[model samples]
Target: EPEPLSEKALREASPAIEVFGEALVSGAYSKSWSYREDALLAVYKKLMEMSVSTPKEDLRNMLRAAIFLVRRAIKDIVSSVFQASLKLLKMIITQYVPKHKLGKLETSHCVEKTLPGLLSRTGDSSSRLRIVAAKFIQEMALWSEVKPLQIVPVHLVQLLKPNSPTHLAMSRVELVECLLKEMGTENSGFTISNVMKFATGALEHRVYEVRDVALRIIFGMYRKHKAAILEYLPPDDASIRKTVLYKTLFDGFTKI
Candidate 1:
């Protein structure tokens, strides 16, 4: 089991939290996640006694503010605050999920309410934000007490789709690139059929570079799972409806 976060001496960090809305919009604490949980735990202690009562309205409003900052940061990716906002968003989720789940009830709410938007940002236009969003998904998936996946629709493949061809859309393409390398993590959960389905869409994608990568990922999957995928790629259009990737390789079904 993972060990609990512990405290250390000679702290330079402050746990002081700014009140609603501003707690999020400010990039002052953007690096909070980088700070050890020890750093935030100190802040957490100062805000209120361990699990002390908190007002529901204040709780909900803060969460709502955090959610908006998520959108704002990505939307204004070029803004002076962009770099800081990415980590700041992580700080917001880290600080609140506890309060939302255990610190205060009725006043506080579940992660499902606002967390999904964070994961959905996997497709955000800004490449940097997309990576940050991916990190958020990874963080929530592994550590957050609340299972955000039950509500947040963080599709592993959707993260693959390109942002645009203007700059080669490497952000999304590269996004998919890193994730595909870890395809086995958490059992990677990808099956030949779903991958086939997603690849079919990719072949017809508007962005050529992304389409190119899509072509590569499947070929790689095919080589590894040859026995498993061959059956799904029947040459017969009658049997397979002949998706583009499979159709060319099909050469029609092998007659018995």
Candidate 2:
């Protein structure tokens, strides 16, 4: 007979599973790569689900352990699997539970309970891990049916603040792009304000990708709140007015 899913089973199983999983992921990442992509993704799926469902007294500690292993796996093995893990996570959060019955409380719970720990992993010293985290957060915000806007704004504000690194700035840009894509033409005053703030910060970012994404997001915001954006635009920046900014806007909005 199969063992029941008790806390003891969870505790004992996780570390061993993680060890073998890390080995496989490491092999996949190493120069002598051999693991199949499907197999790696399967391991990631199992591990992520287990991490989420584990009922440890110290849930954050368990998650931190799991995320640390996952980060190493992501750094060494296949990046696509890492991305798939995040997609699976967002799906589990928003779709595993039906939408009609979901309330603000549930949404808040997912955000407050699950998101911060995930974001902390974003700053892992490993560049691959950091990139994966950034991409994962962006994809989650963009594609999750739950509409994480209310919660994501606070997180974005934190990420976009001054003295942030180039990678962090780039991550914020990707995040803003995802939000604008997900939010579409909705012009809620609060959402608009948040978008503006993100755009302004991104424009000042050292990373060119960050600046470019910020411009794209600004264009998106203008599509919904043109008058509001114009008010915020720098009056004296000719390049912003005529070349990259307006030209891109014209090309983006006008159908050729």
Candidate 3:
């Protein structure tokens, strides 16, 4: 037999959640990644059932229990488990948050505990994981009450710095793009400089792919947030200006 669900907290969850919650915890904690992925899928089906039939209050408790499992699954080393975890998280946030109108009290728990793990996934070797994680972050940004910025792990921002791995830095660049696209310039979650700083720092990245995407992000913002973009640009930066990438981006900025 597998390990019995040991957490006393999970036992207190609603009857609807209790049915599979132990199985979820046990399977997710299994040594096999296959079991972990299967567990998320199984528990998600349970969540879907609760979403339809359970009372609002009970569903929130179920969400709380399910989110804790997400934190566990995210830490799994296998990319399959990682991807499944994000998909499950997205459904909980998108479907339930608005449907039940869950407040910061519930949603913020997921943000505070799981976000750093989600952000770290940006550095994963799987290209699809990089994209999926960023998409998940963007969806979370829509939950304004959770306050995404204040919860951002300080060291996670270091992923944007030169010292970080190129894939990590590049993935962070894309992550910021998702935030900008979803939140726009006016969201109180971040200032223009807060977002632009990532792109500007990445402009000087050693990898052309990183620099090119950074330029595209800068250009995408410039088209819509011209004044805000100008505020972040420096008076003179020979290193970035000398590059053809910057030159092309500069010309695009001029035409707009």
Candidate 4:
């Protein structure tokens, strides 16, 4: 079994956290998953005890060193290692990074380093892990202020389809919805065509839960752009007009 340092020990070692953080990050290469997990948890405890009054540069450097291990461990084959990795990342990204008011350059850099690994995990074969990954993503977007496009790759829409687990499908639908809410229709990086495809495609999903959430996304676009949003759909007679989607779109306001 991998041994973890006590909080008392970590606190006493606090002055060297910058060095110790690098030490823990180096442990990422260990052969045993348990040792990797213990290393991550020890770093987490040390970060938990990290004082906000510390110089911002030290905080920044410490986080930079820790990023390598956290990013790699999130993809760990061992469940506990992944969980420990998630906890460490949540503390840094959602908590300390924001608390420290790191600039956009740093935040975006961290997101660039960390987001891809996290995105790939959403497709994990383990359904429970998929849910954890998706929810963490949703929370991270809210807190990190990362753009919708950064968070939602067009390929992720595949997760919203009927063939996936209901829980995961619902999660993806909500994640897309959350991203849309963050950026709205007019943002520059907003992939209008792909989002239109995702929203409309999900509206056609067989699961009512998926369809219901997707309907809200469509209504959101309609609310923002009026009839212009329908331009992405097929022509009136063949597609939008005859379908439940069209009726639902104009359900309240008859104007468009």
Ranking by TM-score: 3, 4, 1, 2
Clashes of 1: 2
What is the clash count of model 4? 0
Model 1 Cα displacement at 72 (Å)? 2.2
Q: Which ranges of candidate 1 are over 4 A from the true structure?
A: 1-51, 99-154, 158-170, 183-189, 206-208, 234-256
Better of 3 and 4 by TM-score: 3
Per-residue CA lDDT of candidate 2, range 128-161, in tens?
7776677666655654454544566456655375
Looking at model 2, report the run of 10 residues with the lowest lDDT sum: 27-36
TM-score of each: 0.52, 0.50, 0.68, 0.63
Query: Which residue window of length 10 is worst by lDDT in model 4?
Result: 147-156
User: What is the Å distance of residue 142 in model 1 from its true position?
Assistant: 5.8
Ten contiguous residues minimizing lDDT sum, candidate 3: 150-159
CA RMSD of each candidate after superposition: 11.2, 9.0, 5.4, 7.6
Candidate order, lDDT descending: 3, 4, 2, 1
Residue-level lDDT of model 4, residues 1-256, one tens digit each, is: 3245466645544444445653564355466786788888887887677787989888777777667668778778888999898888778766777777776566666666776787677767777888788877766765635553354344345435556656656767777887677656455244666667777778767788888888787777777776666676555554546777666655533553
lDDT of 3 by residue, 73-190 (tens): 7877787887788777877766666667776567667677788787777787888877777667655666554445454423233436656787778777766665556556554444
Give the distance in Å from residue 251's predicted Cα in candidate 2 to where it truly belongs. Answer: 15
How many clashes would you count in candidate 2? 1
- lDDT string for model 1 (42-101, tens) is 333333342435776555554454444344344443433443444554555556545445
Prediction-by-prediction clash tally: 2, 1, 0, 0
Task: Estimate the TM-score for candidate 4.
Answer: 0.63
